[PDB]
């Protein structure tokens, strides 16, 4: 099918550069132009620039003119964006999008970004990779207990309970980003109060960027 | 950036309109106004190009126009699937393009839900690590907006608070968390700390004590 497939997620330090690729299939590459557009979490689309796939001419938003280059490789049907001197505000999703290439002086019907890549997440932070500390959140009716997964970088972490055997009543919350640059999150499970002190509850934390795995028993105090 | 309202809402079956105001240098100068629909976690989809043209397969419920420097998208027969963020865009000259700030479209109808609040004190393990975190977990609320206030005894605390954006749960209600970072001695120096969660004007409060 007609598609644009982008390269994978990147984690970078301030002042570094990142080079994202966008591979086109299903259509005649040099008949089109390709934009790069980005989006910070919860915020608007922002236009960065575009290239004509055939002749390679580009135009960048003046906001990016000093540190952005867009290039294409016709034989590979691929477009690239390279963003230098990265700063924390460059933490966004980056998208490539197909648009028209007009040879004429009048160009109704050519423009409109009709095909989009799936997006590439880039995180720019001064933090170094670090695994979490895991702290127990101790507990008729139901009781809540949990585990606090503290001070890790980068995302993500996964949490299970009792090695996946406990799934009912589990709620893992999205992480907070602290001013230290490190993330924390909590996972809580609601359970029958009568099971406390008989049934064992273990949170299983996996942080694959730091190759850290932690198991922590959560018990009444 | 083109100017769009932050949000628009309507009931199922009704029509809504979203405005996009630019300048005479973009919206006012060219017939290259497009509209994009974006669902959470996905790329935008083109819904209108060339001011008023629907791309193939897009529902006739979507139409647009422009007048002067303002473009307007109208969505008729509102359906729950139309809830999304909508962006306008325009040519701006010199081979550049500009987007609007986006409009969140809410389709009214979903029942209201009061938050469940759970407050955990610092673990003894964390205190021994010379750190203290209070964790206020807020779930199952709708609409998706809450405010959080923390108190040490009865006194307001603003330092050390970190609160997440509300996020949509699998059941279409919302969750958030708020964390209060303290020193161990601050935690032990008060009789109690409280997390107060306000949702559509009503407030829940949980309290914990050393």
């Amino acid at each position: 099918q007609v598609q644009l497939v982008q390269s994978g997620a990147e984690v970078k330090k301030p002042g570094a550069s990142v080079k994202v690729s966008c591979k086109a299939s299903g259509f005649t590459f040099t008949d089109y132009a390709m934009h790069w557009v980005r989006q910070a979490p919860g915020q608007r689309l922002e236009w960065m620039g575009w290239i004509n796939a055939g002749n390679g001419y580009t135009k960048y938003s003046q906001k990016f003119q000093d540190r952005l280059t867009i290039t294409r490789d016709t034989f590979a049907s691929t477009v690239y964006m390279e963003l230098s001197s990265l700063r924390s505000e460059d933490t966004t999703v980056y998208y490539c999008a197909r648009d028209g290439f007009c040879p004429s002086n009048t160009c109704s019907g050519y423009y409109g970004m009709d095909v989009w890549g799936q997006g590439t997440t880039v995180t720019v932070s001064s933090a170094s990779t670090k695994g979490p500390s895991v702290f127990p959140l101790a507990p008729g009716g139901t009781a809540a207990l949990g585990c606090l997964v503290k001070d890790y970088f980068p995302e993500p972490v996964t949490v299970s309970w009792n090695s996946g055997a406990l799934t009912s009543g589990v709620h893992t919350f999205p992480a907070v980003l602290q001013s230290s640059g490190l993330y924390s999150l909590s996972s809580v499970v609601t359970v029958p109060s009568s099971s406390l002190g008989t049934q064992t509850y273990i949170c299983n934390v996996n942080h694959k960027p730091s190759n850290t795995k932690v198991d922590k028993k959560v018990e009444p105090k | 950036a083109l100017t769009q309202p932050a949000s628009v809402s309507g009931s199922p079956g009704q029509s809504i309109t979203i405005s996009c105001t630019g300048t005479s240098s973009d919206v006012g100068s060219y017939n290259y106004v497009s509209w994009y629909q974006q669902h959470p976690g996905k790329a935008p989809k083109l819904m209108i190009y060339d001011v008023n043209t629907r791309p193939s397969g897009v529902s006739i419920r979507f139409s647009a126009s422009k007048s002067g420097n303002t473009a307007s998208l109208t969505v008729s027969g509102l359906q729950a699937e139309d809830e999304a963020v909508y962006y306008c865009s325009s040519y701006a000259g010199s081979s550049t393009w500009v987007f609007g700030g986006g409009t969140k479209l809410t389709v009214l109808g979903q029942p209201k839900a009061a938050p469940s609040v759970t407050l955990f004190p610092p673990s003894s393990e964390e205190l021994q690590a010379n750190k203290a975190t209070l964790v206020c977990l807020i779930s199952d609320f709708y609409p998706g907006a809450v405010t959080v206030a923390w108190k040490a005894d009865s006194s307001p605390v603003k330092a050390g608070v970190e609160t997440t954006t509300p996020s949509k749960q699998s059941n279409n209600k919302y969750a958030a968390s708020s964390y209060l970072s303290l020193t161990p001695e601050q935690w032990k120096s008060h009789r109690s700390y409280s997390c107060q969660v306000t949702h559509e004007g009503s407030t829940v409060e949980k309290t914990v004590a050393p």
């Binding site: 290439f101 160009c107 | 060219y30 017939n31 081979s95």
Partner: peptide, 9 residues
């Protein structure tokens, strides 16, 4: 006046 110019670089 051209509301439909060539936009491409």
């Amino acid at each position: 006046g051209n509301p439909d110019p060539n936009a491409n670089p």
